[PDB]
Amino acid sequence: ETLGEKWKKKLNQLSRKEFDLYKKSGITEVDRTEAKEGLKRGETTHHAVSRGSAKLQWFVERNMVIPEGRVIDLGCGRGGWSYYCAGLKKVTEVRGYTKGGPGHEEPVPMSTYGWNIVKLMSGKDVFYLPPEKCDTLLCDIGESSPSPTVEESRTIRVLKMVEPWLKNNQFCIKVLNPYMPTVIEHLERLQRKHGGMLVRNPLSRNSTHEMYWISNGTGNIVSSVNMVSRLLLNRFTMTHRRPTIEKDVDLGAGTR
Ligand SMILES: C[S@@+](CC[C@H](N)C(=O)[O-])C[C@H]1O[C@@H](n2cnc3c(N)ncnc32)[C@H](O)[C@@H]1O
Ligand SMILES: Cc1cc(N)c(N)cc1Cl
């Protein structure tokens, strides 16, 4: 039994009160107050449509993924990753696919910087989508579940789905449950072929063990995974530490 499996058992034992204090203890988060207010009023400039823009920006600013050319954004939701990439100098086209419908977010139309090079499509289950040529492959799919076996199945499914999209291009792919032994085996095989590394984003909540497989890096998958498991277990042992609050992204306005 993995350290991550022990973390999951502990997370499942929490009351709603305990879970709510735990999930943000010691994490980093952007202040969405101004963006939520502007979006509520129907504003289409400057605001990021979700917390996603800042989450991807964290990786991009550290050169972990360098979006360029034709960007494919799988599970785009409201469009946080897409509208962020649309503003980047090297990016020429952004194509977002999302499921939408009940239980899913719909793409939000925006007028942020470079909006004209973005096309977001809803009603698109990526598990039935044929792979397309692209210079950047983004994937943020992976629904949390109290069952680690359900998360293990969902993660493997995403990992098998993304592989044909990967052809010596830039990438950033969510790995929902990276601690299950069968997932680690798939990741090790994938890293031997396509390279890259698994990275923990400080904007992720403690209630998820999600890590992201980024194209620009190397390192021991097992060690990076166990380091996250150790962090998340230690965050149960102390009293709630308020999250580090950072400024949210300004995505500007204007065409490209
Ligand atoms: C974590 S959210 C993405 C948030 C986004 N990165 C942002 O910045 O706003 C994952 C999204 O994947 C979508 N999704 C889940 N399964 C899907 C599938 N099979 N095909 C397409 N979209 C799916 C969900 O509806 C959800 O909106
Ligand atoms: C519940 C519900 C959510 C969405 N996103 C859509 N498109 C339709 C319905 Cl009925």
State which approach was used to obtain the coordinates. Answer: X-ray
C-alpha–C-alpha distance, residues 213 and 139, integer Å: 10
| Residue 87 tokens, joined | 């503003």
Overall domain count for the chain: 1
8 is catalytic: no
C-alpha–C-alpha distance, residues 53 and 81, integer Å: 5
Cα torsion for 201, 203, 174, 66, to the nearest 10°?
Answer: -60
Atom from ligand 2 closest to the CA of residue 122: 7
250 is catalytic: no
Q: Would you give the end-to-end CA distance of the chain in angstroms?
A: 51
Domain carrying residue 155: 1-256
Residue 253: CB partners within 8 Å, gap ≥ 6? 45, 46, 111, 112, 113
Q: Which entry of 105, 135, 140, 151 is annotated as an active-site residue?
A: 140
174 is catalytic: yes
Residue 116: CB partners within 8 Å, gap ≥ 6? 255, 256
Query: Domain with 173 in it: what CATH number?
Result: 3.40.50.150
| Sole residue written with tokens 């600013």 | 61
Q: Is 17 annotated as a binding residue?
A: no
Contacts 24+ apart (CB under 8 A), 238-244: 238/25, 240/21, 240/22, 240/24, 240/25, 241/25, 241/26, 242/24, 243/24, 243/25, 243/26, 243/27, 243/28, 243/29, 244/26, 244/27, 244/28, 244/29, 244/202
- Write a three-state SS string for 129-188: CCCCCCCEEEECCCCCCCCHHHHHHHHHHHHHHHHHHCCCCEEEEEECCCCCHHHHHHHH
| Sole residue written with tokens 């890096």 | 217
Nearest 5°: phi and psi at 191? Answer: -65, -35
C-alpha–C-alpha distance, residues 137 and 70, integer Å: 9
C-alpha–C-alpha distance, residues 26 and 7, integer Å: 16
Report resolution in angstroms.
Answer: 1.8
